[PDB]
Design an enzyme around this catalytic site. Structure first.
Site, PDB file in Angstrom:
ATOM      1  CE1 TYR A   1       4.269   1.145   2.132  1.00 24.80           C
ATOM      2  CE2 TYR A   1       5.102  -0.932   2.649  1.00 24.80           C
ATOM      3  CZ  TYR A   1       5.184   0.390   2.859  1.00 24.80           C
ATOM      4  OH  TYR A   1       5.649   0.893   3.949  1.00 24.80           O
TER       5      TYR A   1
ATOM      6  CE1 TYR B   1       5.446  -5.544   1.942  1.00 29.89           C
ATOM      7  CE2 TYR B   1       7.534  -5.128   2.375  1.00 29.89           C
ATOM      8  CZ  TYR B   1       6.433  -5.607   1.622  1.00 29.89           C
ATOM      9  OH  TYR B   1       6.650  -5.761   0.054  1.00 29.89           O
TER      10      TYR B   1
ATOM     11  NE  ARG C   1      11.284  -1.272   8.462  1.00 27.50           N
ATOM     12  CZ  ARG C   1      10.889  -0.349   8.526  1.00 27.50           C
ATOM     13  NH1 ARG C   1      10.199   0.384   7.578  1.00 27.50           N
ATOM     14  NH2 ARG C   1      11.129   0.303   9.810  1.00 27.50           N
TER      15      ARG C   1
ATOM     16  CG  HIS D   1       6.695   1.509   8.713  1.00 26.29           C
ATOM     17  ND1 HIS D   1       6.685   0.042   8.454  1.00 26.29           N
ATOM     18  CD2 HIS D   1       6.969   2.321   7.458  1.00 26.29           C
ATOM     19  CE1 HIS D   1       6.990  -0.016   7.233  1.00 26.29           C
ATOM     20  NE2 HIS D   1       7.140   1.119   6.661  1.00 26.29           N
TER      21      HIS D   1
ATOM     22  CG  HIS E   1       7.355   5.040   4.330  1.00 27.74           C
ATOM     23  ND1 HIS E   1       8.604   4.780   4.317  1.00 27.74           N
ATOM     24  CD2 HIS E   1       6.580   3.929   4.384  1.00 27.74           C
ATOM     25  CE1 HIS E   1       8.766   3.626   4.487  1.00 27.74           C
ATOM     26  NE2 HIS E   1       7.650   2.880   4.240  1.00 27.74           N
TER      27      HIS E   1
HETATM   28 FE   LIG Z   1       7.579   0.848   4.441  1.00 30.88          FE
END
Ligand SMILES: [Fe+3]
Ligand SMILES: [Fe+3]
Ligand SMILES: [Fe+3]
Ligand SMILES: [Fe+3]
Lengths: 200, 233, 233, 200, 200, 233, 200
Positions: C105, C144, C154, C157, C159
């Site tokens: 990110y 992630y 995770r 995905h 958001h």
């Molecule tokens: Fe996330």
């Protein structure tokens, strides 16, 4: 009946096989040690020969993305499995067809005679495996020499091919390249003069 | 030199994809029309190269280091090479190649508009160990559009080449990733008639082999033709 | 000014994840211990901002261009926003954020070792049309790793944030990708008790929307609280 | 019974919410137009106030990654829905807590009174939605003002809260910052002094 | 994945196609208005040409019950979709092969250049759809002109055909019929010189 | 000294009983309310004691002689200790303790009215062999009433503690006996959510290992965390 | 995905754990060789220390039936795995709380520094596993020393705990018993000042 674990299914090598198995050809930096098309070093015993050929599809068009693997005995009719770049002779090699001319080449020595399982001698030959995009499972063939007619006539393998006319698809035609002994071996995948492929 | 001491279980040509599988367009012109000629196994076919002495580089098998860091999901692809009898295949040659995270291949002929990754080559080689185990460290490849049907996309896949004990065992295949929705739509995949055979090409997520906070792992075991000793020949 | 002319179907708090879902560790200390207090809807709750006049950039919704080309699987994420009655939600605000192809990110606090992509930011926004349609162009995010259990990952995905017609309909969620094996292992995903609810978060491969030889497509429809006129109040 | 389409399930905003909804905070370039924490421009009618506060978890530790959305009426007790950066006043805004101090701030005006569906007046209030990592579904609260005790005592909403002591959790404490009227509104997600959260 | 409604499946046109789409040929009374083989009226701009051809099956035999539909731009490289018998030019036509000679004819003008989706000009071409008994789903092809070698060499479409020899199957040969410019376009459904057919 | 050469598969905390299982009353007050903190494995966690040189007594593993003969059903409790990969765990410490045939423990705090057995202690230890096998000879313990609900009875059980290769693998558990009707009713047993996990705690009657006219035998195998070698760390 | 065999599930040690692991404590005859609370023999190198503490439940009541196991490096920051009673130092020991006082004691030497997997040094620490009635699965914790502030500040493990206040729960407070160097480490299973417990 008894059923073993099933063998992992084959898949085409794809058009990009070169990146994995013929670094140079893919147009990429190669590693310190590569498996390529020079089975014999100049100082290798036996008659040094140059092998060359093209691969044709069923329309008579060149297959410019083919990948080939060769397995052959040394001059004494002996299989040298211990692969080493330091060896004067390696029984194993790899080659591919040029994206341009579509011709592959191999630098080796004429293999000596090997006996089948039943003790009968086979004519000198090169075991070839053909890979390419459009080929789901590699094709197995054999390269025999036109100057071994006496031996060829008696090969237990060649003799398993029902139709005599088909046996000839397996015979490389002797020539000379730059004053050197060469043999031309064209593979026709499908159609008129389709090359014999084996199952074993 | 090599010795004719073994026999190899005959290949099931109904398990493997056939030569002529029309939906995979290229197969049409590149498939033989004559039946294959069956031949008895001889020293010629029962032997093959041993790559124990090939001089492998230190990151031969590490696609993250062998070409900065590449962009993509960091993964370990590991497994074992065994024969149909379940016998491990020690010191065998395993070669792999693949596209980048975007599905771009570092090859002259690849015209896909996804960009190359300055830190990614996409080639690895590994010699299995005493137990038939191999492992690679790479990035998960992306799907790739190709000129077959008007909207064909290969599932994310890694190309594999396995030598085995002889040229009779030599195999080239493709690893697919567990859950990939593209799998069932692929004409190359579908070259395989039995759904059960397809499953064999699917690598499973392997949380046990992952490095926490680092990379995930996938498990891909390979089965080569069973090797047996000659008998009553 | 806005007017109180609508009522919103009450939220099903058993469908949505609960506040306290202990496997998702952070939720333990950040969940209320007292019961929520129920209140009748008034103008305060039945109204909300209309973003029709926000000045959107030309590539607000195109993550490929809004930050060279990013590295990763090029995809279109499209769908429609409707209410529980199946009524389209026009001129509504859809915002999204995500990691890069590697699970990295672009935020000060992300120290994952996967590298950033010099051509990727990861934020988009789009106003739904007359029919409730929205669409983004981006690259598929990578899984992630995070500090939950010792080896928690995770699933890939995106958001999402959706305004809807009022503050009562405003929602934040996450889109997951069809077939991702990580989905069922996620403590966040698992904050949702009903398997049927989880399915609603899974975007489906949409070949019909893909651009041949360019990018794939995923379909993600969003259902907001049903809006009805007041009656016999 | 009659079942409609189920609403899409909520999921936590996550720790990186900023990248998507609070660009600057994420420490990234913003776009031409951003929805931020300034609801009123200097020339907007009403009494200009500063709103600030902290968010606490169950352990009494600051929640530094929280994200907040506010909805309020203008000074005439009117909801301005047409969101526009050119507007003197916008009823809608966004704010977040600093990664360091963990304090959020908002620049607006004291909201005028609005009537409930039954026609009864509600005390001046600001509707708040709290989002963050660890919060599966956003928390709804209301911010009331200490200097409106009379109104507060008659609020049909405030009065729905069974226990008087709990009602206090909703009242912002009037202060002054740089001689500017400010109100502090701390949120306690869990435990002793736990803020009242609504469902509607 | 997402599945739409399935398209209604194709079926062969059958041998009696004429009764429905080529009344005359069926040997039946025609209606006031019929869609036939005259795309241009004498007074239509562009170079007037006569197109003619034969259709061959895999055995080299004429396909005498074939039906064809053509779509082409006008002389200005513009598609005239509003079909009208009063028009000087219609982009759409229908033709069939004679049960006798098995040759079809079309009276039109040489199409102007049109750009592909990426803005690259395509060589002048006529889109063709072939239907007949034995044809389950109609075949798509393009007719290019041999006197447009320059344009042809650069066509983004013609260039999609991997083998150059295959491209030549799409080029109509300029000739003259009663001292009138004509182009012959033979279609070989299968075998030697098999015409390239498209999917789109 | 010990060295950090291994990594252990992450424990599945949804398989093991959770901390707070209110039916087992004592657990309310003795369970943490904060989430556990996940930490990467280091030499501190991946090593542990080796009891290979501990001086074991001749009847350490024989409760029939290590304290006349005890009264009760003579049985042998044997099995193997393997890791999640199925690998035997040799030279590992297995310790056990239990009540007598009447369900009485030889401990100060035990006030149950069932009498003590003058010839019974209830403690045993055994180092596993090169194949991961252990064996004990004892008498089958009786059920025990305990102060939980007003009429709670522990099924007959033997307490076990297994060291394994590291402190990461160490585990304390309880063995239960095949068919005991009290099993499904026990709140301690029920601390385990998954019925499949419960099954793993059930020793099976093993007639093949019994000594005719002497004693019966039960089989109880133990699975400790999978141990693997570090890779690409 | 790949699933391995499931690890055998944990179960509470029960209140009578002593009979199997703390013989003396149970008030029973011990064996020739027992694993107890004296890690170091008088003549073991390093600073000899005495560790002592209490265990508290969520109501703040003493847990008088706890059983603890400890693992630590020797004064050289070395793990001595080969457990032997003859050893001057053993890295492993066991202790329990008195049914009366509810306090446990251990006799050892202050551990030397060890590096994590990344090569970063961890402050000196003692690994502890806590077992007892009411504890379904043992709790893992670390004991750190108040006189190693510099080191504690840099510990990559101690630094993984988000809230600095929670880090303090892991620091043993140095004192002296009978003029001997001691450190007191109290465990709070639940509630106010709840000790940090680890998962690995
Ligand atoms: Fe996330
Ligand atoms: Fe590929
Ligand atoms: Fe018909
Ligand atoms: Fe017990």
């Amino acid at each position: 009946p008894i059923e073993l674990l099933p063998e992992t299914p084959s898949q085409t090598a794809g058009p990009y096989v070169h990146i994995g198995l013929a670094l140079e050809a893919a147009g990429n930096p190669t590693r310190d040690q590569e498996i390529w098309n020079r089975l014999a070093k100049p100082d290798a015993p036996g008659e040094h020969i140059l092998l060359l050929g093209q691969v044709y599809d069923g329309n008579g068009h060149l297959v410019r993305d083919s990948f080939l693997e060769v397995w052959q005995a040394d001059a004494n009719g002996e299989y040298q499995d211990a692969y080493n770049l330091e060896n004067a002779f390696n029984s194993f090699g790899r080659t591919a067809t040029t994206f341009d001319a579509g011709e592959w080449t191999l630098h080796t020595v004429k293999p000596g005679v090997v006996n089948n399982a039943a003790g009968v001698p086979m004519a000198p030959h090169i075991n070839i495996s053909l890979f390419a995009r459009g080929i789901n499972i590699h094709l197995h063939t054999r390269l025999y020499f036109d100057d071994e007619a006496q031996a060829n006539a008696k090969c237990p393998v060649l003799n398993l091919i029902e139709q005599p006319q088909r046996r000839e698809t397996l015979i490389a035609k002797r020539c000379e390249v730059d004053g050197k002994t060469a043999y031309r071996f064209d593979i026709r995948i499908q159609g008129e003069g389709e090359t014999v492929f084996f199952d074993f | 030199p090599a010795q004719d001491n073994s026999r190899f279980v005959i290949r099931d040509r109904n398990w493997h994809p056939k030569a002529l599988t029309p939906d995979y367009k290229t197969s049409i012109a590149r498939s033989p029309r004559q039946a294959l000629v069956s031949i008895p196994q001889s020293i010629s076919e029962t032997t093959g190269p041993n790559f124990s002495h090939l001089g492998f580089g230190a990151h031969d098998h590490d696609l993250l280091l062998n070409f900065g860091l590449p962009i993509g999901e960091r993964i370990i692809v590991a497994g074992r090479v065994v024969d149909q009898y379940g016998k491990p295949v020690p010191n065998t040659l395993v070669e792999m190649w693949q596209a980048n995270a975007g599905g771009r291949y570092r090859h002259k002929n690849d015209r896909y508009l996804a960009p190359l990754d300055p830190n990614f080559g996409g080639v690895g080689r590994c010699l299995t160990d005493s137990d038939g185990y191999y492992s690679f460290r790479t990035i998960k490849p992306g799907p790739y559009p190709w000129r077959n049907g008007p909207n064909d996309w290969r599932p994310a896949h890694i190309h594999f080449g396995i030598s085995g004990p002889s040229i009779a065992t030599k195999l080239i295949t493709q690893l697919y990733f567990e859950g990939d929705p593209l799998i069932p739509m692929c004409p190359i995949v579908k070259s395989i008639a039995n759904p059960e055979a397809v499953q064999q090409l699917i690598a499973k997520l392997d949380m046990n082999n992952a490095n926490p906070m680092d990379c995930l792992a996938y498990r891909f075991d390979i089965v080569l033709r069973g090797q047996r000793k000659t008998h009553f020949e």
